[PDB]
Design an enzyme around this catalytic site. Structure first.
Site, PDB file in Angstrom:
ATOM      1  N   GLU A  32       0.814  -1.205   0.000  1.00 25.46           N
ATOM      2  CA  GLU A  32       0.000   0.000   0.000  1.00 25.46           C
ATOM      3  C   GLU A  32       0.844   1.250   0.000  1.00 25.46           C
ATOM      4  O   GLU A  32       0.384   2.315  -0.414  1.00 25.46           O
ATOM      5  CB  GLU A  32      -0.943  -0.005   1.205  1.00 25.46           C
ATOM      6  N   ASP A  41      -6.171   5.769  -6.036  1.00 23.60           N
ATOM      7  CA  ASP A  41      -5.416   4.517  -5.949  1.00 23.60           C
ATOM      8  C   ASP A  41      -5.539   3.685  -7.217  1.00 23.60           C
ATOM      9  O   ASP A  41      -6.272   4.044  -8.132  1.00 23.60           O
ATOM     10  CB  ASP A  41      -5.827   3.694  -4.708  1.00 23.60           C
TER      11      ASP A  41
END
EC number: 3.2.1.17
Lengths: 182, 167
Positions: A32, A41
């Protein structure tokens, strides 16, 4: 029965959630990364910190605001490293908590050893419960410990096609039951 | 070599009169804790998350309580610049233990934030309930809807509760 108790109320015996397996925290920091400002994202959604999804859908005003509620201050779309850290902590626990309360994911999670449970949390961390519960046949495959079969099926997904380097690592973890991909 | 790490699930402030009347089936209300304190010989040494691992209760160490800064790789300084008919109805605390683990010193001192410690208690099996550091009962964590409690499953006699209480 072990005891002879007078039972008035419908009290249910309570057992705490399973603790997250090792090394899920290091695993997720790897996949992440960290950003201290709001970003889109790898699946197009506004995120912050260590994979903390802000809004499911548009847009920044709601993102900054749900950030504002998540942190409990004005933020202006920017948080602290230790704020990111505490969000991360919460997120990992909430993921495990959600899996254990998910009629479809829970039997699979229970099936899996610790290393493979990390992989499943990683998926849920990335796509959420509803998304991960959609891999019906791969899940049943996982439940039935057909590692290569689940593994090769998982590479045939949109998920894999959208994020090959992460998906490969996760699928290598599912397949092998090891940490060699990290 | 060798001490006991003790996890406290909850402390329940009761009056002595309530304690003398406790029986199997009695439910003591509690707040479900998120973090809990583990202690050694009654001294709090860490806070932690808790849950299960392999069906055993376990701790994920969050924070050491007042940790010592390791400066053993340097010489000690001479100074530090930082230099009865009617019994009174007293409130009494019941301690409910999540469990304990025996660890060596070396093992205890080698844990920090994120250390996972497995306890000797199984999930589902009843918890120790203590008074003044003395075992007097067992109980199970139980819940209806929103409300959590501890249900007494087993308990010593009133005279014996009194005895452990005084000492």
């Amino acid at each position: 029965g072990p005891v002879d108790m007078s039972n008035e109320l419908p009290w249910q015996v309570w057992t705490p959630d399973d603790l997250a397996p090792p090394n899920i925290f290091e695993m997720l920091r790897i996949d992440e990364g960290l950003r201290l400002k709001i970003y889109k994202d790898t699946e197009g959604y506004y995120t912050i910190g260590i994979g903390h999804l802000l809004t499911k859908s548009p847009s920044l005003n709601a993102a900054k605001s749900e950030l504002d509620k998540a942190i409990g201050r004005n933020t202006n779309g920017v948080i602290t490293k230790d704020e990111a850290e505490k969000l991360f902590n919460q997120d990992v626990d909430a993921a495990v908590r959600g899996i254990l309360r998910n009629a479809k994911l829970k039997p699979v999670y229970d099936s899996l050893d610790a290393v493979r449970r990390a992989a499943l949390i990683n998926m849920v961390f990335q796509m959420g419960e509803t998304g991960v519960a959609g891999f019906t046949n791969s899940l049943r495959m996982l439940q039935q410990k057909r590692w290569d079969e689940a593994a090769v099926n998982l590479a045939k997904s949109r998920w894999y096609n959208q994020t090959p380097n992460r998906a490969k690592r996760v699928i290598t973890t599912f397949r092998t039951g090891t940490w060699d991909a990290y | 070599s060798e001490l006991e790490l003790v996890a406290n699930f909850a402390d329940i402030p009761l009056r002595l009169s309530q304690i003398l009347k406790l029986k199997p089936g009695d439910v003591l209300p509690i707040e479900k804790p998120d973090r809990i304190i583990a202690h050694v010989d009654g001294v709090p040494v860490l806070t932690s998350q808790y849950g299960t691992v392999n069906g055993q209760y376990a701790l994920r160490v969050e924070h050491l309580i007042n940790p010592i800064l390791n400066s053993l790789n340097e010489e000690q300084p001479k100074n530090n610049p930082s230099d009865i008919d009617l019994i009174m109805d007293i409130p009494v605390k019941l301690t409910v233990e999540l469990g304990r683990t025996r660890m060596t010193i070396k093992e205890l001192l080698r844990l920090t934030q994120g250390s996972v410690v497995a306890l000797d208690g199984l999930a589902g099996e009843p918890l120790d309930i203590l008074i003044n550091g003395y075992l007097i009962a067992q109980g199970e964590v139980v819940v209806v809807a929103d409300k959590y409690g501890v249900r007494i499953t087993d308990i010593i006699t009133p005279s014996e509760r009194m005895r452990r209480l005084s000492r």
